[PDB]
């Protein structure tokens, strides 16, 4: 495997493309179905802790209406776009939202005072909330990102754990402080984590697997910033599945004869968000990727993956059902909505490849579909991505646009 | 007595080696037997507060299949690998786990309100938890690291009168894989020095917490222990408690005026704090970035004697403990007796190395130096292993060495950095 | 009239290394325990992270040292002296924080959020509370022991508040640093012995008088120093006991009924040293003593040097527990609890050999500065009344800076 | 037309050191203690870390100074003036935080988490609370006393009864209180209950430096140089007792009923906290080189005087003193008296540059417009009504800068 600087010839033709305003509005905890088809969403789940995986569609340069095609020979060459600049615009103010569970499996507060004897009832769940771990990240490539999470493996009665790799889809949940796991399958009570992840799979980017792939199509460039601390200390209700061994304590008696549950769990906190720590609203110049793919958008497509918990503010909405002169709780309905604002901006460089017998063999082994589409079913359609169609958004006047002006100053053109 | 840069000749031959994905899955608090008798683990001990001591096995370059061996003469020279690049990959998200004890010897909260008289009873232990001190460190050498801890000393004199506090002795020992790092209660043998086994959480209460004896390892003559190291520790006091039980050393009378009535019975001044490692951040990460071992501070400039390498890692920044829950009986209403709760912790590593081939001409002056330094070097060169009693995470790279540095991530980083 | 030690101390190219090896202190962080048999001999010494470590480092007399070649100076007209050019204060043990308290702490009400009227005052309302002290790092190096400051009882002259006087004194090994309650003689100025935790309540906390030591003419006290202090207020309490200075009537409108009896305005805070981090460490790194701010540029007169260290970042107090009676069920009456604290030091030095030609002009200058210099050169010791941690390096000098760690760091820095 | 004093003040190569030596202030951090009769006789002065320290530094008149060689200028056409080129504000005492409170603080309910209806009934619900103030470090240097700002009671209304507010400018005097987190205001006049803020400011005027006015003055005599560092956060949330003077309008809420019919007071107020003090954030104990001022006066000490204004809350530690009235074998509160004391330690160090001015007809006209007193004092006090800490350096000037710490720093910095 060689670099795309040894067989992809760079041209001096640059183009701008922008997504304009992208908006997502919904409920941060769960979706609302249609009263006509359960399997049809009326209000989608939109949360600051969701992955935003943008599948960016580029116009086929081999079919693009260039005013002058004398810069290459279609009899022996084909064209492909190379990403050289990107800025992920983010609207809405900085803030933090909270998530919780009306029946959170919290038993005792194990921070300062939890004396014996225990109070174990058949149902001791509580209505608690918390602020999740703070995470910012962005990934760029011509291949959808690869995530990792823990699920139920193959066969103590503890469920076997297996690390699964999967494509991170738009709407997938990021880790929140409880790990990257399938809460739906590994926590059968549905009450050990808040409702917005309790029946979901939280995925973490498999940076090691994506960095080590031979061609490097997944990670042209990435930034990441995670932070959390332990805010509170609780324990779980229910039978402890793995008792503390006898060599770890001296047995109690009387009021201490019934040992309490050592199934502790912490609540996370993402602490403060600040403008100075933002990874977004600034341009990334994709000059030299660490992998062998230096920003070449094979197949005329690009994947933009974003996590931004720094704007997770959840808005409170309230409606007046009955107008009365004195306040009565039964007169109002409370709702929670969350929004996300994106503005994706790109700078692309047109490239040509002379398809010699050596390069055709190299490209065929790398991806046979590349040569077929060049004229020289899509397995990615089973996944869910936020598609960004830039086929009609390419402009050669980079100065008219913000990111384009930044690009001309950076490159000296 | 001198540096290994004038008798270790550097070549332009470089090789990459990677461990691929390494996973450990187990219980963060204790191991579980299989059973089928003891000494057979069903759930191994895996904790974010454990030392990860990787014994990396390299192929013997004197027996390695180089495509061209005309670069040295085996009649008078021997080959050895030199580490010039390293990146410790870390999977799993950043996070913090908690540890506790269902019978922690905590009596009163001594922070704001603890009025007289005290209410002491034969058993006042409580089910409390805490988040430990945060610690990141990575040590590199061709010799396993040496740790320090406090243990029980020698019975000594004044068996009577005097004080019956156990004698303390500072012990040095090899840090083994799975050993516990200090957590905020010190580097001591909790199993022997805390006989009630209720003063610290269960994951260390019958364990020995070890801290790297940096001063001893830096001062060793040849410098085989620490080619390179990074460290980052932080903690603050989260809560203030005191111990139950008889106070072994009473407060002297010249430090207070005696009480009376309800304050006549003095409370115990055996205080102890709970630690907290505060926040973990990506900006403070020591891992997932390359270390270029250009110039060691010691006399061993990255020469992997014995064709092996030791990478010791502590990383509490990914100590998240996962909660698992199984449904024993499916019913329409929630009942606690219908579920079993479990706690699991995982660790993901991916060790990446770049090595530089080196040759040593065995003159009488160099043979004298190598034999005095370590006679086994010449014997293994032909010109049992006392470390087998210890427990290490072995990483076998004998079949993983590749000369195509551009194909691999760290290799590409090495070529760009060195300008090759 | 004071000149610099660069105008009359000739530098040589001869360097020597010396190291103290492992230095350990093990004891109780709150108090010492005397031997019943010997009132002047100790069974458990007081060892605490809030203590000054004042090392009196003894150097070999270079005028009698066994140099392999002594053709570099003339003993008929010259004398030798060591100059310190490099230092690293090694610190063992992990980073951590210890706590101090008082079983009868004079705390009445928590005055932070809720302290309603009327007050409930009683003849004994002391409590068993603890706290974490102010965090302090410092290192002082010179050929003279450091000068500290603290507040004590002044002279009684014509309110019954004790008169205050700021005293200067030599900081001795084992002296307590200020903990957040100030640099004062708690034994004399706090007669109830319950206003601060027990580890300082009968002690004198001293703060380094940087201004006095920096301004002294010859500059023997501070060749070099580093310092890092930090604290915030964790809790707010008030004192029990009679208020000595009542609030004047022009500062409030009088209460009545349940508010007629004014509560005590003798407030006091609890300190907190906050977090310790590796990035803020002052130790385990070399200090190059190239150019002192004073006129003494690291010349170790009298073949000795004083290193004063405070390091509260490793103040962890270890809990020890012994089993008196082994039973199948846990009973408190079967165990004894103890507290121990330890400190580990490793002092490393690089010295530069110096020669001084004793002209008529220089002999007069040295005689005025310190007559003992010429007398000891042959051309009782008042510091023995003080207590220092003695570090004897007379047999530890080596000219082979190669194998030793700080020497290698020095060779890289100096380019040799 | 204001020009710079680099176009008409000729610089000489004559430099002088001057130091105040150790300055100490000892008193009560909450209030001064007068005589039991005499209005203006102080027994214990008010000394607080939240006070302005405004030093009026007196320099010797260089036109009458005994220079060893006076051949450097011509008195027939020239006059002399001192220029400040170096300054170090030495600070003794340890870093720490003090607390202030009020035994009858007008706090009603804790409005942070739980303040359910109904309101609690009571003609007097004040509480004994304390707090740590906003943290403030600053230093101001000039030849004119600094100008502060504060809010007081304005002029009357032509017919809500809220007192009218007016922003007042005034000279900051030594001992004046800085803002503490409750604003720069005349608490004595604007808070008539004397219970809304702690006692050390409840009958005081808190002033903030009018940086904008002093920066905008034409000649720039107020600010040769300044540093400032402020920080605070909200620690707790309370409300005031007493009638709410301005009711919440009806369009901002739906009226309550039954248990919620009587609205609680929305007159909230927070308690401040200055958070942690650290050595790394210190503004003092370091030299300031006054090379090029932003104003037109580049450090010219007109009138042979200098003003140093300092606020430093990082050493606000209040010491607890306790006296034993009756010595008994058991602790009894009625046997002890509790006191609170605060101290401040200063060491002002200066390097001055001698300057000459050729008094042409154009310059005499320019200086007369600037300040007629300059030429009158040259033979070519309205500030006495104010209270300053007088520092007489007339006999403290020395030409041997190397003998002194800050002087050595000046020679090292300038390369002389």
Residue numbers in the entry:
A (entry chain B): 21 to 175, 183 to 403, 437 to 473
B (entry chain A): 21 to 403, 437 to 473
C (entry chain C): 20 to 177, 183 to 403, 437 to 473
D (entry chain D): 20 to 178, 183 to 403, 438 to 473
The study reports:
HPVs are non-enveloped, double-stranded DNA viruses comprising multiple copies of the major (L1) and minor (L2) capsid proteins. The native T = 7 HPV virion can be mimicked by an empty icosahedral shell, called a virus-like particle (VLP) which consists of 72 L1-only pentamers. High-level neutralizing antibodies elicited by L1 VLPs can block HPV infection; however, protection against HPV infection is type-restricted, and there tends to be little cross-reactivity among HPV types. Each L1 monomer folds into a canonical, eight-stranded β-barrel (BIDG-CHEF), with the strands joined via flexible surface loops (BC, DE, EF, FG, HI).
We solved the crystal structures of pentamers of the lead double and triple chimeric candidates H58-33BC and H58-33BC-52HI to resolutions of 2.5Å and 3.5Å, respectively. By loop swapping with a few aa mutations on HPV58 L1—i.e., S80N, N82T, N84A and V87L for BC loop, T375K, G378S and D383E for HI loop —the resurfaced structural contours of the BC and HI loops of the chimera nearly recapitulate those of the HPV33 BC loop (middle and right) and HPV52 HI loop (right), respectively. These subtle structural resurfacing changes in the engineered regions might provide structural evidence for the cross-protective immunity of the chimeric proteins. H58-33BC-52DE and H58-33BC-52HI also showed high titers (2,280–23,440 and 2,180–87,430, respectively; P < 0.001) as compared with the H58-33BC control. Monkeys (n = 4 per group) were administered with 5 μg of the H58-33BC-52HI chimeric VLPs formulated with aluminum adjuvant at week 0 and 8. Nevertheless, the cross-reactive antibody titers for HPV33 were significantly (26-fold) higher with the chimeric VLPs (960 to 6,290, P < 0.001) than with the HPV58 WT VLPs; reciprocally, the anti-HPV58 antibody titer (6,060 to 40,960) of H58-33BC-52HI was also 54-fold higher than that of HPV33 WT VLPs (P < 0.001). The chimeric VLPs could also elicit a mean neutralization titer of 5,400 (1,780 to 8,460) against HPV52 (middle). Based on our immunogenicity assays in mice and non-human privates, we have successfully generated triple-type chimeric HPV proteins that can simultaneously present three independent immunodominant epitopes, using seven or fewer amino acid substitutions.
